[PDB]
Design an enzyme around this catalytic site. Structure first.
Site, PDB file in Angstrom:
ATOM      1  N   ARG A   1       0.401   2.516 -11.695  1.00 16.35           N
ATOM      2  CA  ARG A   1       1.192   1.780 -10.703  1.00 16.35           C
ATOM      3  C   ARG A   1       2.666   2.174 -10.825  1.00 16.35           C
ATOM      4  O   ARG A   1       3.246   2.084 -11.911  1.00 16.35           O
ATOM      5  CB  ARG A   1       1.023   0.250 -10.878  1.00 16.35           C
TER       6      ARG A   1
ATOM      7  N   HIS B   1       0.799  -1.174   0.000  1.00 15.18           N
ATOM      8  CA  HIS B   1       0.000   0.000   0.000  1.00 15.18           C
ATOM      9  C   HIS B   1       0.860   1.264   0.000  1.00 15.18           C
ATOM     10  O   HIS B   1       1.901   1.325   0.616  1.00 15.18           O
ATOM     11  CB  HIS B   1      -0.868   0.018   1.255  1.00 15.18           C
TER      12      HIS B   1
ATOM     13  N   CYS C   1       0.484   1.958  -5.927  1.00 14.78           N
ATOM     14  CA  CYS C   1      -0.357   2.855  -6.699  1.00 14.78           C
ATOM     15  C   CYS C   1       0.271   4.201  -6.889  1.00 14.78           C
ATOM     16  O   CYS C   1       1.013   4.654  -6.031  1.00 14.78           O
ATOM     17  CB  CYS C   1      -1.720   3.032  -5.973  1.00 14.78           C
TER      18      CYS C   1
END
Ligand SMILES: [Cl-]
Ligand SMILES: [Cl-]
Ligand SMILES: [Cl-]
Length: 180
Positions: free
Chosen positions: A152, A71, A139
């Protein structure tokens, strides 16, 4: 005592089991910099502020590509500052027995369907591998960057050396990320 002969290969583990810890020296002062790496890329793994191994990619130390997802915005540990990584920066994985040290070769910004970035040979899905890579994925937004997710951010690092953890650790490592 940096070893350049083939490193030990990690055995595949079950989903959600821990493989090691990720240490990135450029993230000292950014995150706690002791991010666990676990098998699998579900939210049940990534929400733990852990990196997740893509299960169909190669094992750590194995010829090919050990790819992990993280993340961008998690607390304590995250890939928030993936953008600080430049060619030659170190990406370090610690396991119970071994330090694996990789050096950044480059980064890519891609659409999430561009899975060639995690092929055994980075960006070459048809090619058979010779080298050992790590790949970090997270991301990024075309407009909102850190706070977007239409794209990405991908970092590739080629294996540099390894160390027996009972015998030493890399100079960049400022303190033990784990226990012994
Ligand atoms: Cl996966
Ligand atoms: Cl290699
Ligand atoms: Cl965006």
């Amino acid at each position: 005592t940096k070893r350049t002969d083939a490193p030990p290969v990690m055995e595949q583990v079950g989903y959600g089991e821990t493989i090691g810890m990720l240490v990135v020296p450029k993230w000292y002062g950014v995150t706690n910099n002791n991010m666990p790496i676990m098998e699998g890329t579900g939210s049940d793994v990534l929400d733990q502020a852990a990196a997740g191994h893509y299960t169909n990619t190669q094992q750590l130390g194995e010829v090919g590509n050990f790819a992990i997802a993280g993340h961008r915005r998690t607390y304590g540990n995250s890939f928030r500052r993936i953008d600080l990584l430049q060619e030659g920066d170190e990406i370090i994985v610690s396991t119970a027995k071994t330090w694996y040290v990789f050096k950044v070769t480059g980064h890519e910004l891609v659409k999430p369907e561009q899975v060639e970035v995690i092929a055994p040979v980075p960006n070459q899905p048809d090619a058979q591998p010779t080298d050992r890579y790590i790949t970090l994925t997270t991301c990024h937004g075309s407009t909102a960057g850190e706070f977007g997710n239409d794209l990405r951010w991908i970092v590739h690092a080629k294996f540099a050396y390894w160390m027996d953890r009972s015998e030493g650790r890399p100079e960049s490592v400022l303190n033990d990320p784990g226990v012994n």
